Amino acid sequence: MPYIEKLELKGFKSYGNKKVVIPFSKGFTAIVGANGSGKSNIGDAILFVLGGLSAKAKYAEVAIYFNNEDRGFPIDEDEVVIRRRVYPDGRSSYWLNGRRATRSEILDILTAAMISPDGYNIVLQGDITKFIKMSPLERRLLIDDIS
Amino acid sequence: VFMRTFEAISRNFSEIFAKLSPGGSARLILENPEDPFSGGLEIEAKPAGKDVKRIEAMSGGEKALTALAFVFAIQKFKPAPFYLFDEIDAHLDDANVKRVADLIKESSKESQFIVITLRDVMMANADKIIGVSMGVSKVVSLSLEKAMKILEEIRKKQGW
User: Fold this and answer.
1) Strands (DSSP E) along B8-157, which ranges?
2) How many Cα neighbours within 13 Å face the side chain of A135?
3) Which of A60, A84, B25, B100 is least surrounded by Cβ atoms within 10 Å, i.e. has the fewest?
4) What is d(CA B40, CA B29) in angstroms, rounded to the nearest whole number?
């Protein structure tokens, strides 16, 4: 399964007009910052670009760059870049390697690489409270769905 | 089918809980083993020197650790190419942070992990460290040594 080379943010929440580039090890990367530094917006930028939230400089943009040398994504290129920019009027557009793409096509592409904005592999603040307070019925229902 | 998935995720849970909580044991228990779809799924855990209890009755730290072993067990059953954890260690008890950081470190030999943390043990084990500060946010690749001064600066202003 492929991996994240970097994330680029420009006009997104606390990240301003000068594009910000956030590099990641193929292994383990730790992110250190104070409460309010914008570190939690990193998790938000990732949910934004991977598509969980439908739409329903003066654009916020997030681009994520994946190394696809293992070909986990069904795309015959060594790098897969998913870019999404939200406008003031509320519109939202996506690109996949510089080409326009729809949200529905980006999701299908991520699912194919075993990635989803709803995946268990993303544990944000609030996700641990969720697991702690789940009713036993809901906890068995997660197992039904996974099975 | 439900049962094959359940046993594999339960086995993962008990083994991961045991590694994160030395001398401890835990089980996911079906409320209706007979007719599983008519009952829920409880979590019972027992840290060293404690009686068995269901999740909700544990201590703050025990709850966080148990929930975390549960998510790790699901992740091991159906892995992803990357993990992103945002302050999953904040509510843990000290003694438990190191086992979490060691487990992450070893599974990272095989998958990518991005962990947002204010813990020196988490930081020290990473292949790379990124620091963020602010209004406008800024990001920088950091060495452990400067990462460690910045942490000490933050802990001073914010505590635990």
Assistant:
1) 25-30, 41-46, 53-54, 82-86, 112-116, 128-133, 138-142
2) 5
3) B25
4) 9
Q: How far apart are CA B18 and CA B25, in angstroms?
A: 5
Verify whether the Cβ–Cβ distance A140 to B104 is below 8 Å. Answer: no
Residue A70 neighbours by CB distance under 10 Å: 12
State this model's resolution in angstroms: 2.0
Q: Are A2 and A67 in contact (CB under 8 A)?
A: yes
Residue that has been written with the tokens 């209004």 in this structure: B135
Contacts of B57 (CB under 8 A, 6+ apart): none
- List the single residue in B81, B141, B147 with the smallest CB-CB distance to A115: B81
Overall residue count recorded for chain B in this entry: 160
What beta strand segments (E) does chain A contain?
3-10, 20-23, 28-33, 60-67, 79-86, 92-96, 99-101, 122-123
CATH, residue B122:
3.40.50.300
- Is B9 in a helix, a strand, or coil? helix
Report the distance separating Cα A50 and Cα A4, nearest Å: 12
Q: Does residue A120 belong to the interface with chain B, where contact is any CB pair within 8 Å?
A: yes
3-state class of B78 per DSSP?
coil
Domain count, chain B: 1
- Report how far residue A52's alpha carbon sits from residue A60's, in angstroms, rounded to the nearest whole number: 16
Give the determination technique.
X-ray
Q: Is B84 close to A144, i.e. CB distance below 8 A?
A: no
Q: Kind and range of the H or E element at B8?
A: helix B2-20
Contact B27, B83 (CB under 8 A): no
Element (H, E) at B11: helix B2-20
Placement of tokens 């099975």 in the chain: A147
Max distance between CA atoms of chain A, in angstroms, equals: 48
